[PDB]
Ligand binder design. Structure first.
Ligand SMILES: CCc1[nH]c2nc(Sc3cnc4ncc(=O)[nH]c4c3)nc(N3CC[C@@H](N)C3)c2c1Cl
Length: 193
């Protein structure tokens, strides 16, 4: 399964250099873009956390949490744990840790993984009035041996491109790292312009 991804990451993300490190971001963001395309997500936030980890927040419907008959597991768990807009499990495999929060039907559903392996069963941890999905991941330095340090300008450039290609979407990029905090927000207007 996902162990194959950890041993041959080059076959799944193209490179284990800085390029592959940034590719992880797009693999998660692309899923949020698909939910904007479906018509539900209106805003996406990408955050470089102070420790070079990544958070992606959207306000879509939230990844399905119901048990699938085919697997006997919550759909969201399968998304991150089974190899398949299909790259979530690859990001999981290549991260020291990944946590997902799904905001759906008044509840926050939470699951975490470590180097691709499930920590515990999906659990309701809070009540909420919002909807969407938040994915946070820490890229694995065992995989990304050259660099685990993000390039804000590189991310911002593509985020702007994504805003343009998905006209109407609100998408932002934020750097929370020490001595260089920054945020850029992008939104190209539709017919209301
Ligand atoms: C924060 C990243 C994020 N946000 C999401 N929102 C959603 S919202 C959503 C809600 N209900 C759905 N029902 C059917 C469907 O096909 N797609 C859906 C998508 N789904 C995510 N998935 C599901 C499948 C895979 N593309 C990942 C994600 C992911 Cl991953």
């Amino acid at each position: 399964g996902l162990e194959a991804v950890r041993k041959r990451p080059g076959m799944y993300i193209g490179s284990t250099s800085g390029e592959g490190l940034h590719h992880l971001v797009w693999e998660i963001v692309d899923n949020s873009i698909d939910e904007a395309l479906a018509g539900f997500a209106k805003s996406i936030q990408v955050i470089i956390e102070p420790d070079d980890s990544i958070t992606v927040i959207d306000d879509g419907r939230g990844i399905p949490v119901g048990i699938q008959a085919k697997t006997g597991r919550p759909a969201v768990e399968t998304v991150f744990t089974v190899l398949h807009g299909v790259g979530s499990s690859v990001v999981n495999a290549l991260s020291t840790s990944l946590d997902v929060r799904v905001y759906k039907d008044g509840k926050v559903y939470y699951q975490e993984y470590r180097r691709g392996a499930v920590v515990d069963d999906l659990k309701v941890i809070e009540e909420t009035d919002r909807h969407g999905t938040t994915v946070h991941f820490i890229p694995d330095p065992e995989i990304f041996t050259e660099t685990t340090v993000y390039d804000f300008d590189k991310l911002a450039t593509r985020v702007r491109e994504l805003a343009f290609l998905n006209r109407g979407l609100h998408i932002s990029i934020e750097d929370r790292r020490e001595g260089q905090e920054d945020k850029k927000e992008y939104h190209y207007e539709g017919l209301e312009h």
